């Protein structure tokens, strides 16, 4: 950390943490913004659209109407 080590902010929502905050706890928070499809276990970038993500997740519920096969 430099003279300004208050850069520990989630660049995705700008939640600002103290300089002494856990890097990995920071990263998991960044990875929380990476929207994870529970059915893909894939994390989608913050650059991804929530609308697109929600429709993506919806298609996992849609399942192309899995009737049997
Ligand atoms: Zn955040
Ligand atoms: Zn998915």
Curated annotation (Swiss-Prot):
Disulfide bonds: none
Protein residues bound to Zn(2+) 2: 37, 40, 56, 60
Domain notes: The C-terminal UBZ-type zinc fingers function as ubiquitin-binding domains.
Annotated transmembrane regions: none
UBZ1-type ZnF: 7-33, 34-60
Subunit structure, as described in the record: Homooligomer. Interacts with TNFAIP3. Interacts with STARD13. Interacts with MYO6. Interacts with TOM1; the interaction is indirect and is mediated by MYO6, which acts as a bridge between TOM1 and TAX1BP1. Interacts with MAVS; this interaction induces MAVS polyubiquitination. Interacts with TNIP1. Interacts with TRAF6; this interaction mediates deubiquitination of TRAF6 and inhibition of NF-kappa-B activation. Interacts with RIPK1; this interaction negatively regulates RIPK1 ubiquitination. Interacts with NBR1. Interacts with TBK1. Interacts with RB1CC1. Interacts with SQSTM1.
Taxonomic lineage: Eukaryota, Metazoa, Chordata, Craniata, Vertebrata
Name used for this protein in its record: Tax1-binding protein 1
Binding site residues for Zn(2+) 1: 10, 13, 29, 33
Domain of life where this protein originates: Eukaryota
UniProt function note: Ubiquitin-binding adapter that participates in inflammatory, antiviral and innate immune processes as well as selective autophagy regulation. Plays a key role in the negative regulation of NF-kappa-B and IRF3 signalings by acting as an adapter for the ubiquitin-editing enzyme A20/TNFAIP3 to bind and inactivate its substrates. Disrupts the interactions between the E3 ubiquitin ligase TRAF3 and TBK1/IKBKE to attenuate 'Lys63'-linked polyubiquitination of TBK1 and thereby IFN-beta production.
Tissue localization of expression: Expressed in all tissues tested.
Compartment annotation: Cytoplasm; Mitochondrion; Preautophagosomal structure; Cytoplasmic vesicle, Autophagosome
């Amino acid at each position: 950390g430099p003279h300004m080590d208050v850069h520990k902010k989630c660049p995705l929502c700008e939640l600002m943490f103290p300089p002494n905050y856990d890097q990995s706890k920071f990263e998991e928070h960044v990875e929380s913004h990476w929207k994870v499809c529970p059915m893909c276990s894939e994390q989608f970038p913050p650059d991804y659209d929530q609308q697109v993500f929600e429709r993506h997740v919806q298609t996992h519920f849609d399942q192309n109407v899995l009737n049997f096969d």
